[PDB]
Symmetry: D2
Subunit: 120 residues, 4 copies
Amino acid sequence: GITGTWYNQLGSTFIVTAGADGALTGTFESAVGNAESRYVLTGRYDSAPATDGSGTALGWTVAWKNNYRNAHSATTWSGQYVGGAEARINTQWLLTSGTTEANAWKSTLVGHDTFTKVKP
Amino acid sequence: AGITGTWYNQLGSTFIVTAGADGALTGTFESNAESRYVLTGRYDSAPATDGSGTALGWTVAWKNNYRNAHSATTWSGQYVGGAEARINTQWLLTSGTTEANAWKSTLVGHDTFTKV
Amino acid sequence: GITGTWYNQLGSTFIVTAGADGALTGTFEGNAESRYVLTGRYDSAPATDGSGTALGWTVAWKNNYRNAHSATTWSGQYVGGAEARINTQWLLTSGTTEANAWKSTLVGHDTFTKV
Amino acid sequence: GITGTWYNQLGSTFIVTAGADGALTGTFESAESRYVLTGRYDSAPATDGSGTALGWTVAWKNNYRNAHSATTWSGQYVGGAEARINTQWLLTSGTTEANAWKSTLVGHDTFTKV
Protein backbone atom coordinates (compact mmCIF):
# COMPACT_ATOMS: atom_id res chain seq x y z
CA GLY A 1 0.00 0.00 0.00
CA ILE A 2 0.97 3.68 0.10
CA THR A 3 1.49 3.86 3.86
CA GLY A 4 5.13 3.28 4.72
CA THR A 5 8.67 4.54 4.39
CA TRP A 6 9.86 5.19 0.86
CA TYR A 7 13.12 6.47 -0.67
CA ASN A 8 13.71 8.30 -3.93
CA GLN A 9 16.58 7.68 -6.29
CA LEU A 10 18.81 10.10 -4.37
CA GLY A 11 18.07 8.55 -1.00
CA SER A 12 15.59 11.12 0.31
CA THR A 13 13.23 9.62 2.88
CA PHE A 14 9.42 9.89 2.47
CA ILE A 15 7.49 8.69 5.55
CA VAL A 16 3.78 8.76 4.69
CA THR A 17 0.45 7.61 6.04
CA ALA A 18 -2.58 7.23 3.74
CA GLY A 19 -5.79 7.95 5.66
CA ALA A 20 -9.12 6.34 4.98
CA ASP A 21 -10.44 9.78 3.90
CA GLY A 22 -7.93 10.31 1.04
CA ALA A 23 -5.39 12.24 3.16
CA LEU A 24 -1.63 11.92 2.98
CA THR A 25 0.39 13.06 6.00
CA GLY A 26 3.98 12.55 7.10
CA THR A 27 7.49 13.84 6.77
CA PHE A 28 10.09 14.29 4.06
CA GLU A 29 13.88 14.41 4.53
CA SER A 30 15.82 15.43 1.38
CA ALA A 31 19.18 14.01 0.39
CA VAL A 32 19.85 17.19 -1.66
CA GLY A 33 19.24 20.89 -1.56
CA ASN A 34 19.06 23.69 1.03
CA ALA A 35 17.39 21.28 3.33
CA GLU A 36 18.17 19.54 6.84
CA SER A 37 16.08 17.20 8.96
CA ARG A 38 12.51 16.43 8.41
CA TYR A 39 9.86 18.70 6.86
CA VAL A 40 6.08 18.36 7.13
CA LEU A 41 4.15 17.11 4.11
CA THR A 42 0.47 16.90 3.33
CA GLY A 43 -1.34 15.65 0.26
CA ARG A 44 -4.19 13.59 -1.21
CA TYR A 45 -4.62 10.25 -2.94
CA ASP A 46 -7.39 8.34 -4.72
CA SER A 47 -8.80 6.09 -1.99
CA ALA A 48 -10.87 4.07 -4.49
CA PRO A 49 -8.64 3.46 -7.53
CA ALA A 50 -9.85 1.89 -10.82
CA THR A 51 -9.81 -1.89 -10.79
CA ASP A 52 -8.48 -2.21 -14.38
CA GLY A 53 -4.71 -2.45 -13.67
CA SER A 54 -4.15 1.28 -13.41
CA GLY A 55 -2.03 2.91 -10.72
CA THR A 56 -3.34 5.03 -7.82
CA ALA A 57 -3.11 8.81 -8.39
CA LEU A 58 -1.66 10.95 -5.60
CA GLY A 59 0.15 14.19 -4.85
CA TRP A 60 1.79 15.98 -1.93
CA THR A 61 3.53 19.19 -0.97
CA VAL A 62 6.57 20.11 1.13
CA ALA A 63 7.27 23.76 1.98
CA TRP A 64 11.02 23.85 2.71
CA LYS A 65 10.69 25.57 6.11
CA ASN A 66 11.31 23.78 9.41
CA ASN A 67 12.90 24.90 12.69
CA TYR A 68 16.35 24.61 11.26
CA ARG A 69 16.31 26.15 7.77
CA ASN A 70 14.00 28.01 5.37
CA ALA A 71 14.67 27.86 1.62
CA HIS A 72 11.59 29.97 0.73
CA SER A 73 10.40 27.29 -1.68
CA ALA A 74 7.92 24.43 -2.03
CA THR A 75 7.97 21.17 -3.97
CA THR A 76 4.82 19.44 -5.17
CA TRP A 77 5.03 15.79 -6.34
CA SER A 78 2.24 14.52 -8.65
CA GLY A 79 2.24 10.86 -9.58
CA GLN A 80 0.88 7.37 -9.12
CA TYR A 81 1.46 4.34 -6.87
CA VAL A 82 2.09 1.13 -8.81
CA GLY A 83 1.72 -2.02 -6.72
CA GLY A 84 3.56 -5.20 -7.41
CA ALA A 85 6.54 -7.22 -6.27
CA GLU A 86 8.52 -4.10 -6.22
CA ALA A 87 6.05 -1.42 -5.38
CA ARG A 88 6.85 2.06 -6.71
CA ILE A 89 5.58 5.63 -6.57
CA ASN A 90 6.42 7.34 -9.88
CA THR A 91 6.28 11.14 -9.75
CA GLN A 92 6.96 14.38 -11.57
CA TRP A 93 7.52 17.46 -9.41
CA LEU A 94 7.56 21.23 -9.51
CA LEU A 95 9.68 23.30 -7.06
CA THR A 96 8.76 26.97 -6.87
CA SER A 97 10.85 29.51 -4.98
CA GLY A 98 9.55 32.87 -3.83
CA THR A 99 11.08 35.45 -6.18
CA THR A 100 10.78 39.09 -7.13
CA GLU A 101 8.62 39.74 -10.18
CA ALA A 102 11.75 40.33 -12.29
CA ASN A 103 12.99 36.85 -11.37
CA ALA A 104 9.63 35.03 -11.66
CA TRP A 105 10.45 33.53 -15.09
CA LYS A 106 13.13 31.40 -13.31
CA SER A 107 11.13 30.58 -10.19
CA THR A 108 10.26 26.95 -10.99
CA LEU A 109 12.29 23.75 -11.39
CA VAL A 110 10.83 20.55 -12.82
CA GLY A 111 12.03 17.00 -12.30
CA HIS A 112 11.02 13.40 -11.69
CA ASP A 113 11.42 11.21 -8.62
CA THR A 114 10.82 7.46 -8.35
CA PHE A 115 10.23 6.01 -4.88
CA THR A 116 10.71 2.43 -3.68
CA LYS A 117 10.75 0.81 -0.19
CA VAL A 118 14.62 0.23 -0.62
CA LYS A 119 17.21 3.04 -0.13
CA PRO A 120 20.07 3.64 -2.58
CA ALA B 1 0.16 36.05 5.27
CA GLY B 2 -2.67 37.31 2.93
CA ILE B 3 -3.58 33.85 1.67
CA THR B 4 -6.66 32.88 3.69
CA GLY B 5 -9.90 33.37 1.76
CA THR B 6 -11.45 32.76 -1.64
CA TRP B 7 -9.53 32.77 -4.92
CA TYR B 8 -10.67 32.56 -8.53
CA ASN B 9 -8.95 31.46 -11.75
CA GLN B 10 -10.07 32.70 -15.15
CA LEU B 11 -11.84 29.44 -16.16
CA GLY B 12 -14.66 29.27 -13.65
CA SER B 13 -12.85 27.55 -10.71
CA THR B 14 -12.87 28.74 -7.09
CA PHE B 15 -11.17 27.66 -4.10
CA ILE B 16 -11.37 28.52 -0.55
CA VAL B 17 -8.33 28.13 1.69
CA THR B 18 -7.20 28.69 5.25
CA ALA B 19 -3.48 29.37 5.78
CA GLY B 20 -2.75 28.05 9.30
CA ALA B 21 -0.13 29.52 11.63
CA ASP B 22 1.90 26.29 11.22
CA GLY B 23 2.25 26.45 7.42
CA ALA B 24 -0.80 24.37 6.57
CA LEU B 25 -3.17 25.02 3.70
CA THR B 26 -6.65 23.47 4.06
CA GLY B 27 -9.84 24.03 2.10
CA THR B 28 -11.96 23.16 -0.90
CA PHE B 29 -11.60 23.49 -4.68
CA GLU B 30 -14.81 23.85 -6.77
CA SER B 31 -16.65 25.24 -9.75
CA ASN B 32 -22.54 22.57 -6.66
CA ALA B 33 -21.52 19.77 -4.36
CA GLU B 34 -20.61 17.41 -7.19
CA SER B 35 -17.90 19.91 -8.23
CA ARG B 36 -16.30 20.39 -4.75
CA TYR B 37 -13.11 18.56 -3.65
CA VAL B 38 -10.86 18.60 -0.60
CA LEU B 39 -7.58 20.47 -0.92
CA THR B 40 -4.52 20.30 1.33
CA GLY B 41 -1.05 21.84 1.03
CA ARG B 42 1.74 23.85 2.60
CA TYR B 43 3.09 27.39 2.42
CA ASP B 44 6.16 29.28 3.67
CA SER B 45 4.95 30.95 6.92
CA ALA B 46 8.11 33.07 7.23
CA PRO B 47 8.79 34.44 3.68
CA ALA B 48 11.77 36.54 2.82
CA THR B 49 11.56 40.28 3.48
CA ASP B 50 13.20 41.38 0.22
CA GLY B 51 10.05 41.80 -1.93
CA SER B 52 9.93 38.16 -3.00
CA GLY B 53 6.65 36.22 -3.14
CA THR B 54 5.58 33.48 -0.76
CA ALA B 55 6.15 29.88 -1.95
CA LEU B 56 3.26 27.46 -1.60
CA GLY B 57 1.69 24.35 -3.09
CA TRP B 58 -1.41 22.18 -2.75
CA THR B 59 -3.04 18.97 -3.99
CA VAL B 60 -6.55 17.99 -5.05
CA ALA B 61 -7.36 14.34 -5.67
CA TRP B 62 -10.33 14.41 -8.07
CA LYS B 63 -12.50 12.10 -5.96
CA ASN B 64 -15.49 13.24 -3.89
CA ASN B 65 -18.66 11.47 -2.72
CA TYR B 66 -20.20 11.86 -6.20
CA ARG B 67 -17.43 11.06 -8.69
CA ASN B 68 -13.91 9.82 -9.16
CA ALA B 69 -11.66 10.80 -12.07
CA HIS B 70 -8.77 8.62 -10.75
CA SER B 71 -6.44 11.61 -10.95
CA ALA B 72 -4.78 14.30 -8.86
CA THR B 73 -3.54 17.83 -9.55
CA THR B 74 -0.73 19.56 -7.70
CA TRP B 75 -0.27 23.35 -7.94
CA SER B 76 3.16 24.77 -7.12
CA GLY B 77 3.59 28.53 -7.08
CA GLN B 78 3.94 31.74 -5.14
CA TYR B 79 1.61 34.32 -3.59
CA VAL B 80 2.30 37.92 -4.54
CA GLY B 81 0.71 40.55 -2.32
CA GLY B 82 -0.04 44.22 -2.98
CA ALA B 83 -2.70 46.19 -4.72
CA GLU B 84 -3.25 43.37 -7.18
CA ALA B 85 -2.66 40.21 -5.10
CA ARG B 86 -2.27 36.99 -7.05
CA ILE B 87 -1.30 33.33 -6.66
CA ASN B 88 0.79 32.39 -9.74
CA THR B 89 1.03 28.63 -10.26
CA GLN B 90 2.16 25.85 -12.49
CA TRP B 91 0.41 22.50 -12.11
CA LEU B 92 0.77 18.76 -12.80
CA LEU B 93 -2.31 16.53 -13.31
CA THR B 94 -1.50 12.82 -13.02
CA SER B 95 -4.06 10.16 -13.95
CA GLY B 96 -3.79 6.57 -12.82
CA THR B 97 -2.73 4.52 -15.80
CA THR B 98 -1.44 1.09 -16.72
CA GLU B 99 2.31 0.96 -17.17
CA ALA B 100 1.79 0.78 -20.96
CA ASN B 101 -0.01 4.13 -20.84
CA ALA B 102 2.27 5.83 -18.24
CA TRP B 103 3.91 8.01 -20.90
CA LYS B 104 0.62 9.86 -21.27
CA SER B 105 -0.30 10.00 -17.55
CA THR B 106 0.61 13.64 -16.77
CA LEU B 107 -0.64 16.99 -18.04
CA VAL B 108 1.15 20.26 -17.26
CA GLY B 109 -0.23 23.79 -17.25
CA HIS B 110 -0.44 27.11 -15.47
CA ASP B 111 -3.09 29.08 -13.68
CA THR B 112 -3.29 32.47 -11.99
CA PHE B 113 -5.68 33.12 -9.10
CA THR B 114 -7.06 36.48 -7.99
CA LYS B 115 -9.32 37.67 -5.19
CA VAL B 116 -11.96 39.09 -7.52
CA GLY C 1 0.31 32.41 -40.25
CA ILE C 2 3.35 31.48 -38.23
CA THR C 3 5.98 33.23 -40.32
CA GLY C 4 6.72 36.66 -38.84
CA THR C 5 8.12 38.60 -35.91
CA TRP C 6 6.70 37.64 -32.49
CA TYR C 7 7.17 39.07 -28.98
CA ASN C 8 6.64 37.26 -25.61
CA GLN C 9 5.22 38.82 -22.49
CA LEU C 10 8.72 39.91 -21.32
CA GLY C 11 9.58 41.58 -24.64
CA SER C 12 11.87 38.90 -26.11
CA THR C 13 11.71 38.86 -29.93
CA PHE C 14 11.12 35.66 -31.94
CA ILE C 15 11.76 35.99 -35.69
CA VAL C 16 10.62 32.83 -37.49
CA THR C 17 9.95 31.36 -40.91
CA ALA C 18 7.59 28.39 -41.39
CA GLY C 19 8.77 26.38 -44.38
CA ALA C 20 6.75 24.25 -46.68
CA ASP C 21 8.18 20.99 -45.12
CA GLY C 22 7.21 21.67 -41.48
CA ALA C 23 10.48 23.45 -40.69
CA LEU C 24 10.85 26.41 -38.34
CA THR C 25 14.01 28.54 -38.65
CA GLY C 26 14.96 31.96 -37.29
CA THR C 27 16.48 33.88 -34.42
CA PHE C 28 15.56 34.60 -30.78
CA GLU C 29 16.75 37.69 -28.93
CA GLY C 30 18.02 44.34 -29.45
CA ASN C 31 21.74 43.95 -29.46
CA ALA C 32 23.67 41.42 -31.43
CA GLU C 33 25.15 39.80 -28.39
CA SER C 34 21.69 38.73 -27.27
CA ARG C 35 20.73 37.02 -30.57
CA TYR C 36 20.63 33.23 -30.93
CA VAL C 37 19.71 30.65 -33.62
CA LEU C 38 16.52 28.70 -33.29
CA THR C 39 15.21 25.67 -35.18
CA GLY C 40 12.03 23.64 -34.80
CA ARG C 41 9.03 21.98 -36.42
CA TYR C 42 5.31 22.64 -36.90
CA ASP C 43 2.24 20.74 -38.16
CA SER C 44 2.00 21.83 -41.83
CA ALA C 45 -1.52 20.33 -42.21
CA PRO C 46 -3.52 21.13 -39.06
CA ALA C 47 -7.03 19.94 -38.36
CA THR C 48 -9.96 21.88 -39.90
CA ASP C 49 -12.16 21.79 -36.80
CA GLY C 50 -11.02 25.05 -35.09
CA SER C 51 -8.07 23.53 -33.26
CA GLY C 52 -4.67 25.27 -33.13
CA THR C 53 -1.48 24.27 -34.93
CA ALA C 54 1.04 22.31 -32.90
CA LEU C 55 4.68 23.40 -32.98
CA GLY C 56 7.95 23.49 -31.05
CA TRP C 57 11.46 24.95 -31.28
CA THR C 58 14.84 25.02 -29.53
CA VAL C 59 17.45 27.65 -28.75
CA ALA C 60 20.86 26.63 -27.42
CA TRP C 61 22.19 29.65 -25.45
CA LYS C 62 25.52 29.84 -27.27
CA ASN C 63 26.30 32.47 -29.89
CA ASN C 64 29.53 34.16 -31.06
CA TYR C 65 29.65 36.25 -27.85
CA ARG C 66 28.32 34.28 -24.92
CA ASN C 67 27.70 30.65 -23.78
CA ALA C 68 25.39 29.80 -20.89
CA HIS C 69 25.79 26.01 -21.33
CA SER C 70 22.01 25.67 -21.55
CA ALA C 71 19.13 25.22 -24.00
CA THR C 72 15.40 26.06 -23.98
CA THR C 73 12.64 24.20 -25.81
CA TRP C 74 9.20 25.77 -26.35
CA SER C 75 6.25 23.43 -27.03
CA GLY C 76 2.88 24.91 -27.92
CA GLN C 77 0.32 25.85 -30.50
CA TYR C 78 -0.43 28.68 -32.92
CA VAL C 79 -3.96 30.07 -32.63
CA GLY C 80 -4.87 32.15 -35.71
CA GLY C 81 -7.39 34.93 -36.07
CA ALA C 82 -7.44 38.72 -35.89
CA GLU C 83 -5.01 38.45 -33.06
CA ALA C 84 -2.79 35.55 -33.76
CA ARG C 85 -1.07 34.00 -30.71
CA ILE C 86 1.46 31.28 -30.01
CA ASN C 87 0.88 29.79 -26.53
CA THR C 88 3.80 27.78 -25.14
CA GLN C 89 5.25 25.90 -22.24
CA TRP C 90 9.04 25.73 -22.06
CA LEU C 91 11.88 23.75 -20.51
CA LEU C 92 15.35 25.29 -19.90
CA THR C 93 18.03 22.66 -19.21
CA SER C 94 21.51 23.67 -18.04
CA GLY C 95 24.47 21.31 -18.15
CA THR C 96 25.09 19.89 -14.64
CA THR C 97 27.10 17.18 -13.03
CA GLU C 98 25.30 14.00 -12.38
CA ALA C 99 24.92 14.90 -8.70
CA ASN C 100 23.17 18.12 -9.61
CA ALA C 101 20.96 16.86 -12.37
CA TRP C 102 17.85 17.16 -10.17
CA LYS C 103 18.22 20.97 -10.43
CA SER C 104 19.08 21.13 -14.14
CA THR C 105 15.69 22.15 -15.58
CA LEU C 106 13.48 25.21 -15.24
CA VAL C 107 9.87 25.23 -16.53
CA GLY C 108 7.64 28.14 -17.49
CA HIS C 109 5.11 29.42 -19.96
CA ASP C 110 5.37 32.16 -22.62
CA THR C 111 2.69 33.68 -24.83
CA PHE C 112 3.74 35.34 -28.08
CA THR C 113 1.90 37.89 -30.19
CA LYS C 114 2.80 39.93 -33.27
CA VAL C 115 2.54 43.14 -31.17
CA GLY D 1 29.65 12.20 -28.86
CA ILE D 2 26.08 13.04 -29.83
CA THR D 3 26.16 12.05 -33.50
CA GLY D 4 24.72 8.60 -34.17
CA THR D 5 21.86 6.35 -33.17
CA TRP D 6 19.96 6.53 -29.85
CA TYR D 7 17.41 4.19 -28.28
CA ASN D 8 14.87 4.40 -25.46
CA GLN D 9 13.20 1.58 -23.50
CA LEU D 10 9.84 1.94 -25.30
CA GLY D 11 10.93 0.92 -28.79
CA SER D 12 11.81 4.32 -30.20
CA THR D 13 15.01 5.04 -32.14
CA PHE D 14 16.47 8.20 -33.59
CA ILE D 15 19.51 9.00 -35.72
CA VAL D 16 21.06 12.44 -35.30
CA THR D 17 23.93 14.46 -36.70
CA ALA D 18 25.39 17.07 -34.29
CA GLY D 19 26.77 19.73 -36.66
CA ALA D 20 29.78 21.90 -35.90
CA ASP D 21 27.47 24.95 -35.88
CA GLY D 22 25.25 23.64 -33.07
CA ALA D 23 22.59 22.03 -35.30
CA LEU D 24 20.81 18.78 -34.56
CA THR D 25 19.24 17.10 -37.61
CA GLY D 26 17.88 13.59 -38.06
CA THR D 27 15.00 11.18 -38.00
CA PHE D 28 12.92 9.76 -35.17
CA GLU D 29 11.26 6.32 -35.51
CA SER D 30 8.45 5.76 -33.07
CA ALA D 31 8.05 2.03 -33.63
CA GLU D 32 5.58 4.88 -41.84
CA SER D 33 6.60 5.71 -38.26
CA ARG D 34 9.55 7.94 -39.14
CA TYR D 35 9.51 11.70 -38.59
CA VAL D 36 11.91 14.62 -39.06
CA LEU D 37 13.80 15.78 -35.96
CA THR D 38 15.48 19.20 -35.69
CA GLY D 39 17.11 21.01 -32.75
CA ARG D 40 20.16 22.69 -31.25
CA TYR D 41 22.95 21.80 -28.84
CA ASP D 42 25.84 23.56 -27.04
CA SER D 43 28.76 23.08 -29.49
CA ALA D 44 31.32 24.28 -26.90
CA PRO D 45 30.33 22.54 -23.68
CA ALA D 46 32.32 22.68 -20.45
CA THR D 47 34.86 19.92 -19.76
CA ASP D 48 34.25 19.99 -16.01
CA GLY D 49 32.02 16.89 -15.58
CA SER D 50 28.85 18.74 -16.67
CA GLY D 51 26.62 17.44 -19.41
CA THR D 52 26.08 19.05 -22.81
CA ALA D 53 22.79 20.99 -23.02
CA LEU D 54 20.54 20.22 -26.01
CA GLY D 55 16.97 20.15 -27.27
CA TRP D 56 15.00 19.01 -30.28
CA THR D 57 11.47 18.93 -31.72
CA VAL D 58 9.45 16.34 -33.65
CA ALA D 59 6.12 17.42 -35.19
CA TRP D 60 4.14 14.14 -35.47
CA LYS D 61 3.28 14.58 -39.18
CA ASN D 62 4.84 12.55 -42.01
CA ASN D 63 3.53 11.61 -45.45
CA TYR D 64 1.35 8.80 -43.93
CA ARG D 65 0.12 9.99 -40.52
CA ASN D 66 -0.58 13.20 -38.59
CA ALA D 67 -1.32 13.37 -34.84
CA HIS D 68 -1.68 17.18 -34.89
CA SER D 69 0.90 17.36 -32.13
CA ALA D 70 4.59 18.04 -31.46
CA THR D 71 7.06 16.95 -28.80
CA THR D 72 10.05 18.91 -27.56
CA TRP D 73 12.83 17.20 -25.60
CA SER D 74 15.06 19.37 -23.38
CA GLY D 75 18.04 17.73 -21.72
CA GLN D 76 21.71 16.98 -21.52
CA TYR D 77 24.14 14.53 -23.13
CA VAL D 78 26.38 12.70 -20.63
CA GLY D 79 29.41 11.04 -22.24
CA GLY D 80 31.70 8.24 -21.24
CA ALA D 81 31.54 4.49 -21.53
CA GLU D 82 27.82 4.43 -20.88
CA ALA D 83 26.70 7.58 -22.58
CA ARG D 84 23.14 8.85 -22.18
CA ILE D 85 20.84 11.64 -23.25
CA ASN D 86 18.62 12.47 -20.25
CA THR D 87 15.53 14.47 -21.18
CA GLN D 88 12.32 15.98 -20.02
CA TRP D 89 9.71 16.51 -22.72
CA LEU D 90 6.51 18.41 -23.53
CA LEU D 91 3.93 17.10 -26.05
CA THR D 92 1.44 19.74 -27.19
CA SER D 93 -1.59 18.83 -29.28
CA GLY D 94 -3.58 21.31 -31.34
CA THR D 95 -6.80 22.01 -29.39
CA THR D 96 -9.71 24.42 -29.40
CA GLU D 97 -9.38 27.22 -26.86
CA ALA D 98 -11.90 25.55 -24.57
CA ASN D 99 -9.58 22.58 -24.37
CA ALA D 100 -6.28 24.37 -24.23
CA TRP D 101 -5.92 23.65 -20.52
CA LYS D 102 -5.37 19.97 -21.39
CA SER D 103 -3.23 20.46 -24.50
CA THR D 104 0.19 19.53 -23.02
CA LEU D 105 1.62 16.29 -21.63
CA VAL D 106 4.92 16.24 -19.72
CA GLY D 107 7.33 13.40 -19.09
CA HIS D 108 10.91 12.19 -19.08
CA ASP D 109 12.95 9.86 -21.23
CA THR D 110 16.51 8.56 -21.32
CA PHE D 111 18.25 7.48 -24.46
CA THR D 112 21.30 5.18 -24.75
CA LYS D 113 23.73 4.22 -27.54
CA VAL D 114 23.10 0.51 -27.03
